[PDB]
Structure 1
């Protein structure tokens, strides 16, 4: 079991490559300021996660901005605030402001030299196009919840991706599914028979943050605390 055995990295984006937690914390600041309260980042992410998961209907909405706008309305209500139309508009379009993790671009640019790179996203294609401009590489394949007809962890998202990659020349055993979310990615990757690389982005933090809690702990074949550390492990494997 070696990193170099694989031909394609199939990525989660939001939480693995894009730091969506920092993006959400930043995007909630205008609304939070009106409460007069003081929130930690963990507290804001708890509020976001408790109010976003209900919006994850079985059939995906066409536009992720509609989820964010509905979340804004829910959070304004929870905080005893009246919603503001301009704040809602800015919050709903905020994916374009969500930053990459500081290590992501250099890691992706290295791994692009050696692997086919694929995206599996629950956030829609045009939002991901905005994030992609910050990620420093072109992705060979991009699969969204709108393509599949469901959100991960639905098994259809993984069979859709596996079939797409097979048609592109990548056998299932040559896929390494690389992602932070045990719930969204590694439980269904396990069930689908994929090998997993767990990027534990919250390794130095408490809890799951903006990420849904998993029903079980999945098996993972590789563990890294960052994308940069995955790239370093590949470099070390090639050196012997």
Structure 2
């Protein structure tokens, strides 16, 4: 099993390609100021992570800004605060400001020479365009939660993706699903019969950050600590 066996990379975006943690910590600062407490980054991230997937179950057809607005309301409620409409809007429209990780553009541009690059992300189409402008590549296919009518880890998100790629001549065996999230991505990839590459962005940190806790450790086929490290691996695999 090696990287060159695959024709397509299918990606998790937020937490793998885009550094959503930096974005969420920054966007929660005004709400946090109202509590009087200094929170650590992990505290902010974990209250997000206990709330985002429940919200996506609650409103599975919501656009992502509406998810984020409702997550703001959930966090405010854990903190004993009444929501403030303008603060909620500033949080919920913050994806425009969530940066790429510093290795992402270079890695994606390299990998685009060798694979079809696909997005399977908990996002809506228009919102994703904002992030795509920070990623430096044309994606061959983009599958969003909006397209499916639900969010990962719903199995239908993976079936939709697999089907779309089959119609473009990419068999399931051709796909390498590339993602940080054990909960959103590699557990349902296991169940869907996909090969997995774990991009362990938090390898040097505690817990899962903004990502929901996974119910088990899925079985992954590759692990890289960053996207640059995946690209460097491919440059040697290609010589074989």
TM-score scaled by structure 1?
0.96
Q: Say whether the 8 Å CA contact 1:105–1:136 is kept in structure 2.
A: yes
Alpha-carbon distance in structure 1 between the residues aligned to 2:145 and 2:14? 13
Alpha-carbon distance in structure 1 between the residues aligned to 2:228 and 2:22? 18
RMSD: 1.3
Partner of 1:117: 117
Segment of structure 1 superposing worse, 215-224 or 53-62 = 53-62
**Structure 1 stretches of 5 or more lacking a match?**
none
**Structure 2 stretches of 5 or more lacking a match?**
none
Distance change >3 Å, CA 6–CA 58, structure 1 → 2: farther
Distance change >3 Å, CA 85–CA 58, structure 1 → 2: closer
Q: Say whether the 8 Å CA contact 1:117–1:140 is kept in structure 2.
A: yes
TM-score scaled by structure 2?
0.96
User: 1:45-84, CA deviations, whole angstroms, 9 ceiling, x for partnerless residues?
Assistant: 1121223232112662331111111122222232233332
Alpha-carbon distance in structure 1 between the residues aligned to 2:119 and 2:36? 39
The residue matched to 2:159 in structure 1 has which SS?
A: helix
TM-superposed deviation, 1:122: 1.3
TM-superposed deviation, 1:237: 1.5
Partner of 2:86: 86
Segment of structure 1 superposing worse, 71-80 or 117-126 = 71-80
Q: Say whether the 8 Å CA contact 1:59–1:149 is kept in structure 2.
A: no
Equivalent pairs counted in the alignment come to 240
Does residue 38 of structure 2 align to residue 38 of structure 1? Answer: yes
Segment of structure 1 superposing worse, 33-42 or 199-208 = 33-42
TM-superposed deviation, 1:165: 0.3
User: 1:209-239, CA deviations, whole angstroms, 9 ceiling, x for partnerless residues?
Assistant: 1111222211111100000100000011123
Distance change >3 Å, CA 193–CA 51, structure 1 → 2: closer
